[model samples]
Target: STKKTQLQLEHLLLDLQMILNGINNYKNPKLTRMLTFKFYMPKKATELKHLQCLEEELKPLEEVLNLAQSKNFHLRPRDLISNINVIVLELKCEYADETATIVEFLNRWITFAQSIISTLT
Candidate 1:
């Protein structure tokens, strides 16, 4: 559980940064190209049963990307970024208590965290 939580927290941070970068690079055609490329890739394995945590996070982004490509929907970059930002914010809130518990546990049991880290590596 601790290992999963830590991975998810780190993944969330990366997702937040990626979304921010997306917003910053919204003007670049290359950004759109790469995003589209990601949309079509084959599914790889995930730690989670259904999807990798990051891959699951991307489901909404994929939806927006598909909508953007559609004729009916006018999916602006800002709207997409806004949706991602909301997701980030929601995740932070959702994990707040668990993160605090993790911190408390680590303070008392650094060895425990380190044990899992070594095993994962």
Candidate 2:
């Protein structure tokens, strides 16, 4: 939990950045699912597209956070997962056919990514 070392912190931050950046790069409004009477969407296929559609890297961070569940609770890497899912979800779920709003989540993550690093020591 609070006893995390440099490596532990590095692994967590690195993976988080990798996945988020990958999503930022890959997720396209034009790239999504299709339907006859309706339309489907993404999250797994989009944000998670980097490594196992994000399912792979996210679980490890979750694994560490869940290990003790004490001080680690503040880490909240799972929100990262959901935040990413939200990005993918809203983008494809509605009239957002030509544009996808990534500002809120990206700004939030920028803050989170910065603050978490300070605790790495």
Candidate 3:
């Protein structure tokens, strides 16, 4: 049982790290402008709002993971999945060209996160 948990944690840690990188890439200002379908135009509220929400959702998860990595704290994998699910659901309601990539990753991360939790248990 302990070995199983450790394996799960290892896989989950890698997945979360990838997620953070993906999220950070998505939030980059240059990429953000390009995705908004208005590379040359001023950013609209929809574009800004969607990205803001995405960053907001990712920030806490990054913080938790950062702390875990620095302090050797055990992660509560279930809570992370739950939080991601909620964010994915919230993003599902809004749509814009700029959001396509972020939404794709959000869905992918939710599934990956859930898979980690399920396999760990």
RMSD per prediction, one decimal?
15.0, 15.1, 14.5
Clash totals in order: 0, 2, 0
Per-residue C-alpha lDDT of model 1 across residues 20-121, encoded as one tens digit per residue:
344334353443443333222213222223223333335555444443323222345455446544543443301112222211221222233234345555
User: What shift in Å separates residue 95 of candidate 1 from its native position after superposition?
Assistant: 16
Q: For residues 6-116, could you state the per-residue lDDT of candidate 2 as single tens digits?
A: 344344445456434433333323212211112111232222122232232334334433323232223354665565444433322122233222322233334443465
Measure candidate 1: CA RMSD. 15.0
Q: After superposition, how far is residue 6 of candidate 3 from its true place, in Å?
A: 5.8
Give lDDT: candidate 1, residue 2: 57
Model 1 scores worst on lDDT over the 10 consecutive residues at 93-102
Query: lDDT of each model, Cα atoms only?
Result: 0.37, 0.36, 0.41
Which structure among the candidates has the greatest TM-score? 2
Q: Estimate each model's TM-score.
A: 0.26, 0.30, 0.27
